Amino acid sequence: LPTSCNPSDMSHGYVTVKPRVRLHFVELGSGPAVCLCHGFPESWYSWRYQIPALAQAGYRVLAMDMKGYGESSAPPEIEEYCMEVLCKEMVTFLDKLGLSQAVFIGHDWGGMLVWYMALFYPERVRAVASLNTPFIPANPNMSPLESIKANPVFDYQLYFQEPGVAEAELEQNLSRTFKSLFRASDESVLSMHKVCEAGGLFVNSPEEPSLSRMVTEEEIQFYVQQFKKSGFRGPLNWYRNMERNWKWACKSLGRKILIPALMVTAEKDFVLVPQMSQHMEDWIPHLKRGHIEDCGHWTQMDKPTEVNQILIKWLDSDAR
Ligand SMILES: O=C(Cn1cc(C(=O)C(F)(F)F)c2cc(Br)ccc21)NC1CCCCCC1
Ligand SMILES: [Br-]
């Protein structure tokens, strides 16, 4: 396993992007700035195997707690978590750090964010990489509701819409929640396509799940402690701006991403399947790619060595 991170041995940074919205990050290394943006329901700590490796390779790594998470602010309002607001806040973050540009690397919702940053703020994005999450141009002729209903494996997203419902289930037993979620593909105890019918994520899953081979008890407990701070409302709110996000995205239609760009697919992510990325070169002509076999949704901790090799190869070449 690559070198990991001990939270108390990190530098912890805090930037107020607006009154009452303060973003926390950890920072390691010197060199060009690289900003890592996690997914749902994660942490800066999801990048624990990439932070040392990137620092060692000659980068200044800034691993965020995204808004809603960890030591970052978690306001309750849904519209605080639309992409337009989130991206503008990441630009403010760079401004207050005095960074003209950073490389942005995201996974999952953080992947979506970094695509949006590359599209709307290219002057601030030196290069962009996404793990698992593709870049799909908004289709102005289709409602987000339609699109989500048109894919069985997105059913959990409908469950996530009604405020309070998923929060209560996810918060009920945090250790159960993270042990249930953070599993390899072959260890999965959940089906994303059968959730609204069933009445929740964990209705058919073990009350006392085993520990995945991917994680230790201590690592699970870190996530538990982080999610006692603000719970899952802010995180889930990332999913509750589908119309607002689509309207914003439509404003960028026709624009091509011309900065250096990397798309990394994961063979065994059964929601963000590799084939979802198949047309991206239409919009990102000089896209580069990596592909990780035997890798599920939780890319960074499933295949940390492979992620590190892909990112470093790309950083040291196409991205410069
Ligand atoms: O919804 C997710 C994250 N996500 C949650 C999963 C769960 O098990 C949980 F219970 F937590 F909800 C989950 C499971 C797999 Br497999 C993959 C991804 C998962 N990401 C979206 C994907 C769609 C469009 C792009 C933006 C990001
Ligand atoms: Br999966």
Numbering used by the authors: 228 to 547
The authors write:
It catalyzes the hydrolysis of epoxy fatty acids, such as epoxyeicosatrienoic acids (EETs), to their corresponding vicinal diols. The active site of sEH-H consists of the catalytic triad Asp335-Asp496-His524 as well as the two stabilizing residues Tyr381 and Tyr465 opposite of the catalytic triad serving as an oxyanion hole.
Herein, we report the identification and characterization of epoxykynin, a potent inhibitor of the soluble epoxide hydrolase (sEH). Epoxykynin inhibited the hydrolase activity of purified sEH very potently with an IC50 value of 6.7 ± 3.2 nM. Additional analysis of inhibition of the phosphatase domain of sEH by means of an AttoPhos-based assay showed that the sEH-H and sEH-P inhibitor ebselen, but not the sEH-H inhibitors AR928150 and epoxykynin impeded the activity of sEH-P in this assay. The crystal structure revealed that epoxykynin binds to the catalytic center of sEH-H, occupying the binding site of the endogenous epoxide substrates. The N-alkyl amide binds to the catalytic triad of sEH-H, while the lipophilic cycloheptane occupies a deep hydrophobic pocket. The constraint indole ring creates distance to the small, electron-withdrawing bromo and trifluoroacetyl substituents.
